[PDB]
Write an enzyme that holds these catalytic residues in place. Structure first.
Site, PDB file in Angstrom:
ATOM      1  N   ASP A   1      -6.707   7.427  10.663  1.00  0.00           N
ATOM      2  CA  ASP A   1      -7.135   6.689   9.187  1.00  0.00           C
ATOM      3  C   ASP A   1      -5.941   5.538   8.812  1.00  0.00           C
ATOM      4  O   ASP A   1      -5.222   5.760   8.819  1.00  0.00           O
ATOM      5  CB  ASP A   1      -8.058   7.775   8.649  1.00  0.00           C
ATOM      6  CG  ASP A   1      -8.040   8.206   7.770  1.00  0.00           C
ATOM      7  OD1 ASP A   1      -6.676   8.158   7.474  1.00  0.00           O
ATOM      8  OD2 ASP A   1      -7.963   8.766   6.742  1.00  0.00           O
TER       9      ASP A   1
ATOM     10  N   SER B   1     -15.948   1.381 -14.073  1.00  0.00           N
ATOM     11  CA  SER B   1     -16.730   0.969 -13.310  1.00  0.00           C
ATOM     12  C   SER B   1     -18.048   1.122 -13.141  1.00  0.00           C
ATOM     13  O   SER B   1     -18.421   0.397 -13.036  1.00  0.00           O
ATOM     14  CB  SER B   1     -15.852   0.536 -11.817  1.00  0.00           C
ATOM     15  OG  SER B   1     -15.033  -0.175 -11.264  1.00  0.00           O
TER      16      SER B   1
ATOM     17  N   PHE C   1     -18.138   8.133   1.277  1.00  0.00           N
ATOM     18  CA  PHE C   1     -18.056   8.454   2.394  1.00  0.00           C
ATOM     19  C   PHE C   1     -16.169   8.299   2.446  1.00  0.00           C
ATOM     20  O   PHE C   1     -15.404   8.994   2.961  1.00  0.00           O
ATOM     21  CB  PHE C   1     -18.548   7.501   3.515  1.00  0.00           C
ATOM     22  CG  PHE C   1     -18.644   7.730   4.842  1.00  0.00           C
ATOM     23  CD1 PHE C   1     -17.922   7.335   5.407  1.00  0.00           C
ATOM     24  CD2 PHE C   1     -19.433   8.816   5.228  1.00  0.00           C
ATOM     25  CE1 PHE C   1     -17.361   7.973   6.726  1.00  0.00           C
ATOM     26  CE2 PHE C   1     -19.463   8.985   6.919  1.00  0.00           C
ATOM     27  CZ  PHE C   1     -18.250   8.585   7.380  1.00  0.00           C
TER      28      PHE C   1
ATOM     29  N   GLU D   1     -16.553   1.798   9.542  1.00  0.00           N
ATOM     30  CA  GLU D   1     -15.184   2.567  10.075  1.00  0.00           C
ATOM     31  C   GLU D   1     -14.933   2.903  11.575  1.00  0.00           C
ATOM     32  O   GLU D   1     -14.167   3.009  11.911  1.00  0.00           O
ATOM     33  CB  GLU D   1     -15.975   3.866   9.960  1.00  0.00           C
ATOM     34  CG  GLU D   1     -16.191   4.253   8.615  1.00  0.00           C
ATOM     35  CD  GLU D   1     -15.266   4.703   7.695  1.00  0.00           C
ATOM     36  OE1 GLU D   1     -14.153   4.547   7.841  1.00  0.00           O
ATOM     37  OE2 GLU D   1     -14.870   4.226   6.188  1.00  0.00           O
TER      38      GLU D   1
ATOM     39  N   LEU E   1     -12.954  11.822   9.218  1.00  0.00           N
ATOM     40  CA  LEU E   1     -11.962  13.137   9.122  1.00  0.00           C
ATOM     41  C   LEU E   1     -12.399  14.620   9.099  1.00  0.00           C
ATOM     42  O   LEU E   1     -12.875  14.735   8.630  1.00  0.00           O
ATOM     43  CB  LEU E   1     -11.795  12.793   7.157  1.00  0.00           C
ATOM     44  CG  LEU E   1     -10.246  13.559   6.371  1.00  0.00           C
ATOM     45  CD1 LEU E   1      -9.462  12.774   7.167  1.00  0.00           C
ATOM     46  CD2 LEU E   1     -10.483  13.354   5.025  1.00  0.00           C
TER      47      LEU E   1
ATOM     48  N   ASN F   1     -13.555  -5.413 -12.296  1.00  0.00           N
ATOM     49  CA  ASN F   1     -13.540  -3.846 -12.278  1.00  0.00           C
ATOM     50  C   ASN F   1     -12.709  -2.701 -11.316  1.00  0.00           C
ATOM     51  O   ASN F   1     -11.763  -1.514 -11.508  1.00  0.00           O
ATOM     52  CB  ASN F   1     -13.528  -2.830 -14.262  1.00  0.00           C
ATOM     53  CG  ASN F   1     -13.071  -1.541 -13.837  1.00  0.00           C
ATOM     54  OD1 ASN F   1     -13.400  -0.678 -13.349  1.00  0.00           O
ATOM     55  ND2 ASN F   1     -12.420  -1.406 -15.083  1.00  0.00           N
TER      56      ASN F   1
END
Ligand SMILES: Fc1c(F)c(F)c(F)c(F)c1F
Ligand SMILES: [Cl-]
Length: 164
Positions: A20, A117, A104, A11, A32, A132
């Site tokens: 972002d 998945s 996140f 990040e 965010l 996947n």
């Protein structure tokens, strides 16, 4: 390595409002603020988050505080989600970090399509799960980060984060 150090790599840290990868107003360590195109709306969310009139700039201490809250909230969210809790519980601590990383970044709405998945991860079919996971908007839009997260799920090691 741990979830905090991992997400810090993925990040970065920025102390002024920035956009972002999706174009959304954000601050600190991938916090965010809002999906609104209004900078004033972002600044409002920032002030509400921090508890003071900031005008778009925060300290490193403040950024880390929000970061800790965000990591905590992601984990707590996973544990309250019936579709995510079983898979998460089935994992070792390194792969749990990879799971928290995804939540996140994309939230629980973002991971809703990862049903297949998730099954493969719970089955511990690591190579199949990895293949996947890559078949996603996620991988296409953020390939370098997705590859690191996927390698973590594949190996159960921090190898993709060594050197960084
Ligand atoms: F909670 C999650 C997991 F445990 C996962 F294993 C995973 F791949 C996700 F995307 C999640 F959101
Ligand atoms: Cl600003």
């Amino acid at each position: 390595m741990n979830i905090f150090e991992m997400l810090r790599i993925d990040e970065g840290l920025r102390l002024k409002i920035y956009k972002d990868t999706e174009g959304y107003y954000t601050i600190g360590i991938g916090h965010l603020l809002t999906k609104s195109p209004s900078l004033n709306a972002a600044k409002s969310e920032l002030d509400k988050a921090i508890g003071r009139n900031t005008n778009g700039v925060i300290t490193k201490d403040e950024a880390e505080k929000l970061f800790n809250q965000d990591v905590d909230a992601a984990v707590r969210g996973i544990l309250r989600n019936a579709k995510l809790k079983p898979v998460y519980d089935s994992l070792d601590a390194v792969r749990r970090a990879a799971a928290i990383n995804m939540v996140f970044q994309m939230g629980e709405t973002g991971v809703a399509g990862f049903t297949n998945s998730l099954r493969m991860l719970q089955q511990k079919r690591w190579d199949e799960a990895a293949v996947n996971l890559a078949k996603s908007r996620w991988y296409n839009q953020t390939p370098n980060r997705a590859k690191r997260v996927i390698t973590t799920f594949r190996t159960g090691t921090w190898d993709a984060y060594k050197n960084l």
